[PDB]
Amino acid sequence: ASMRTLLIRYILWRNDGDPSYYNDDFKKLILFDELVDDDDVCTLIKNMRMTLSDGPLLDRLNQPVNNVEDVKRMIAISAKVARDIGRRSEIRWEDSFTILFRMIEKYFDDLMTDLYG
Amino acid sequence: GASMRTLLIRYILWRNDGDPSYYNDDFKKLILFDELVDDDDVCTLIKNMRMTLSDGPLLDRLNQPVNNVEDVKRMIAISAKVARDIGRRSEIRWEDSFTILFRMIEKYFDDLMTDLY
């Protein structure tokens, strides 16, 4: 419930890069970036620009999640796509969050352990 | 336009948890909308959410029609007051409330940026 709020704030901050909205709470989440190849991101961005939509990101977030590693990768690709699509992108972020949390809510306990245990 | 979506999410989340490390002066003009909302309409909504153990009544309030910028400011203000008064412990899927809020008020984002700036 802290996780829901934190991940929303984190993905919105990666989107706009406004440093008045930075928070040290994000530092441990930035470390998930190593799980994600920047060519998978570059391809997603190209597909979102070709479809003029979050469509391809929603498809990536609907891919199944089996463990905390898949969760960290799903948060990281959300974050990298949020940064690289640019602050002007009129994305319904609530639609991405709805799917992200449907897939990773089960693992919120396992994720708080990995971060703060 | 993308700015309004981000700002209103950050504002409603901040009213919910009251964490002062997430305060931003950008919220100051949104706090002014509070005068449009009677604290007895809020008290009734909170009571109905606690009696039903659900966001049900908030989702119903956000589904009431929006005809002008005034209705938008009132809808943002009641979201915000409910977020503060329901408490940080409340297991609310905030994305579900944002989905409805933005279905109703996205049309008026341009009129709302004018009013604010």
Side-chain angles (χ1 to χ4, degrees), chain B residues 53-54 63 75 89 95:
Chain B
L53 268 202
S54 91
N63 265 299
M75 191 161 282
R89 286 255 95 72
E95 60 275 16

Side-chain angles (χ1 to χ4, degrees), chain B residues 13 15-17 21 26 35 40-41 43 47-48 51-52 59-60 64 66 71 74-75 83 90 92 101-102 105 108 114:
Chain B
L13 290 184
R15 282 297 273 266
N16 181 236
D17 79 353
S21 74
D26 293 345
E35 282 140 33
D40 293 326
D41 289 349
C43 182
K47 195 198 139 199
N48 283 327
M51 200 168 205
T52 67
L59 302 193
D60 293 341
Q64 286 168 22
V66 168
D71 289 333
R74 185 168 310 101
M75 191 161 282
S90 304
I92 294 173
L101 176 70
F102 299 138
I105 77 159
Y108 298 88
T114 306

Side-chain angles (χ1 to χ4, degrees), chain B residues 36-55:
Chain B
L36 298 178
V37 168
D38 188 8
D39 287 32
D40 293 326
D41 289 349
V42 172
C43 182
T44 290
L45 233 44
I46 291 297
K47 195 198 139 199
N48 283 327
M49 287 161 77
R50 288 195 199 302
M51 200 168 205
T52 67
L53 268 202
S54 91
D55 65 359

